[PDB]
Amino acid sequence: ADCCRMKECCTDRVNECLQRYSGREDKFVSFCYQEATVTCGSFNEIVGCCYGYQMCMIRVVKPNSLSGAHEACKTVSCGNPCA
Amino acid sequence: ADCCRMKECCTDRVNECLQRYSGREDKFVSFCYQEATVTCGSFNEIVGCCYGYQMCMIRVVKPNSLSGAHEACKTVSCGNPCA
Ligand SMILES: [Zn+2]
Ligand SMILES: [Zn+2]
């Protein structure tokens, strides 16, 4: 229904999901992103609920460093939601 | 300093603190709120960084129910920051 609510939900669910993987969070970024786009919905299933956020998190997230990644990536641009 | 940025930092940090307490998160809500106001600061040490949120989380946080509590409580009214 709304791309902006979708973003908010996407970043928050990814972060909450990644806190179940402590020590291993870098391995589960994509797992958590997939779960988040199912939960929050998306306008393109492949793109997901915020693509830019997934890329930022893949680049920044390192083991036992999750919070820093949340603060670094949460305001990043999502990019084209459609393609 | 910005009360609104304070609130955002507060609810996020409380949420992140409580995730170290899986299964027992209800015992640590006030603990985590205090940790959060240390990180995020406050305008009244006794009130903390978002009073309304602390009340909501104390009420709604149950073991293994944290995500449900965050989603419902994060945008809640903080009340008077001064007293
Ligand atoms: Zn955070
Ligand atoms: Zn949440």
Side-chain angles (χ1 to χ4, degrees):
Chain A
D2 189 77
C3 164
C4 195
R5 293 203 302 265
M6 178 176 307
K7 176 174 187 174
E8 299 172 352
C9 173
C10 191
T11 68
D12 180 33
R13 303 291 180 275
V14 165
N15 187 53
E16 293 173 284
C17 162
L18 286 172
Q19 284 130 336
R20 291 182 264 137
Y21 299 103
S22 308
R24 316 136 66 194
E25 31 273 312
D26 50 320
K27 287 304 170 290
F28 288 93
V29 175
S30 291
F31 165 82
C32 288
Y33 181 76
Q34 175 57 43
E35 295 297 289
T37 104
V38 163
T39 305
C40 310
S42 64
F43 297 106
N44 179 319
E45 276 177 325
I46 299 142
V47 173
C49 45
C50 187
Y51 195 72
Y53 182 70
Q54 186 202 36
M55 297 309 306
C56 183
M57 292 291 275
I58 286 177
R59 299 175 178 162
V60 169
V61 170
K62 62 200 197 174
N64 308 290
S65 74
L66 181 54
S67 171
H70 192 231
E71 265 48 74
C73 296
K74 64 185 180 177
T75 57
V76 174
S77 299
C78 292
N80 191 333
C82 312
Chain B
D2 187 73
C3 164
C4 196
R5 187 180 62 250
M6 177 176 306
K7 175 176 188 173
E8 299 173 351
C9 169
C10 191
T11 63
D12 179 42
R13 249 36 80 112
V14 168
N15 185 53
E16 296 174 322
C17 165
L18 285 174
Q19 286 157 329
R20 297 185 270 139
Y21 301 109
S22 308
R24 46 182 192 152
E25 36 272 307
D26 54 319
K27 275 176 44 209
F28 291 92
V29 175
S30 286
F31 165 83
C32 285
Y33 179 77
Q34 216 56 46
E35 184 182 275
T37 101
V38 167
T39 301
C40 311
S42 68
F43 296 109
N44 182 325
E45 42 207 340
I46 295 144
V47 176
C49 49
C50 187
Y51 194 75
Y53 179 70
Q54 188 199 205
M55 297 311 306
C56 185
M57 291 290 274
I58 288 176
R59 169 187 321 119
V60 171
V61 172
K62 304 304 162 86
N64 309 325
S65 76
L66 181 56
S67 172
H70 193 238
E71 277 27 282
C73 296
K74 63 183 179 173
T75 63
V76 137
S77 297
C78 291
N80 193 330
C82 309

Short mmCIF file of all heavy atoms in Angstrom, two decimals, chain A residues 15 19 66-68 70-71 74, chain B residues 12-13 16, ligand 1:
data_model
loop_
_atom_site.label_atom_id
_atom_site.label_comp_id
_atom_site.label_asym_id
_atom_site.label_seq_id
_atom_site.Cartn_x
_atom_site.Cartn_y
_atom_site.Cartn_z
N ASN A 15 16.99 -5.60 10.72
CA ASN A 15 17.80 -5.45 11.94
C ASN A 15 17.39 -6.45 13.07
O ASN A 15 18.25 -7.17 13.64
CB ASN A 15 17.71 -3.99 12.40
CG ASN A 15 18.65 -3.66 13.57
OD1 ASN A 15 19.85 -3.92 13.50
ND2 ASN A 15 18.12 -2.99 14.59
N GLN A 19 19.52 -9.80 14.65
CA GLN A 19 19.91 -9.99 16.06
C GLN A 19 19.68 -11.43 16.56
O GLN A 19 20.03 -11.75 17.69
CB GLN A 19 19.23 -8.98 17.00
CG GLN A 19 19.86 -7.60 16.92
CD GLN A 19 18.89 -6.51 16.73
OE1 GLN A 19 17.78 -6.74 16.23
NE2 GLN A 19 19.30 -5.27 17.06
N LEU A 66 26.45 -5.34 14.59
CA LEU A 66 25.17 -5.00 13.95
C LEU A 66 24.69 -3.56 14.16
O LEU A 66 24.35 -2.89 13.18
CB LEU A 66 24.08 -5.98 14.40
CG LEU A 66 22.70 -5.75 13.78
CD1 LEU A 66 22.75 -5.71 12.27
CD2 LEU A 66 21.78 -6.87 14.24
N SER A 67 24.64 -3.09 15.40
CA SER A 67 24.15 -1.75 15.72
C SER A 67 24.76 -0.65 14.85
O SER A 67 24.03 0.18 14.29
CB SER A 67 24.43 -1.44 17.19
OG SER A 67 24.16 -0.09 17.49
N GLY A 68 26.08 -0.69 14.70
CA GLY A 68 26.79 0.26 13.85
C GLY A 68 26.29 0.25 12.41
O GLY A 68 26.19 1.31 11.76
N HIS A 70 23.19 -0.78 11.54
CA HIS A 70 21.85 -0.19 11.57
C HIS A 70 21.99 1.33 11.42
O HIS A 70 21.39 1.91 10.52
CB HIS A 70 21.11 -0.51 12.88
CG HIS A 70 19.64 -0.18 12.85
ND1 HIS A 70 19.02 0.58 13.81
CD2 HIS A 70 18.69 -0.48 11.93
CE1 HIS A 70 17.75 0.72 13.51
NE2 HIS A 70 17.52 0.09 12.37
N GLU A 71 22.79 1.95 12.28
CA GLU A 71 22.93 3.41 12.26
C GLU A 71 23.52 3.92 10.95
O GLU A 71 23.19 5.02 10.50
CB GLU A 71 23.75 3.89 13.46
CG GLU A 71 22.86 4.31 14.63
CD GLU A 71 21.77 3.28 14.95
OE1 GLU A 71 22.09 2.21 15.51
OE2 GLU A 71 20.59 3.55 14.63
N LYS A 74 20.41 2.78 7.80
CA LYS A 74 18.95 2.94 7.88
C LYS A 74 18.38 4.09 7.05
O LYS A 74 17.24 4.01 6.61
CB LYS A 74 18.50 3.03 9.34
CG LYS A 74 18.92 4.19 10.21
CD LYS A 74 18.36 3.87 11.63
CE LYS A 74 18.67 4.92 12.70
NZ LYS A 74 18.03 4.56 14.03
N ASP B 12 15.19 2.94 19.51
CA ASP B 12 16.01 1.98 18.80
C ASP B 12 16.98 1.28 19.76
O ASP B 12 17.03 0.03 19.83
CB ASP B 12 16.77 2.67 17.67
CG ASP B 12 17.66 1.73 16.90
OD1 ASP B 12 17.24 0.59 16.61
OD2 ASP B 12 18.80 2.13 16.60
N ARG B 13 17.69 2.07 20.56
CA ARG B 13 18.64 1.55 21.53
C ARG B 13 17.98 0.63 22.59
O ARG B 13 18.55 -0.40 22.96
CB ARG B 13 19.38 2.71 22.19
CG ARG B 13 20.87 2.83 21.83
CD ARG B 13 21.17 2.45 20.38
NE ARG B 13 20.87 3.51 19.43
CZ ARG B 13 21.80 4.18 18.74
NH1 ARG B 13 23.08 3.87 18.88
NH2 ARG B 13 21.43 5.14 17.89
N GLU B 16 17.43 -2.64 20.87
CA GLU B 16 18.67 -3.36 20.64
C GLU B 16 19.25 -3.94 21.94
O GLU B 16 19.83 -5.03 21.94
CB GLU B 16 19.68 -2.44 19.94
CG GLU B 16 19.18 -2.02 18.53
CD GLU B 16 20.08 -1.00 17.86
OE1 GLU B 16 20.58 -0.12 18.58
OE2 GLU B 16 20.22 -1.05 16.61
ZN ZN C 1 19.95 0.96 15.69
#
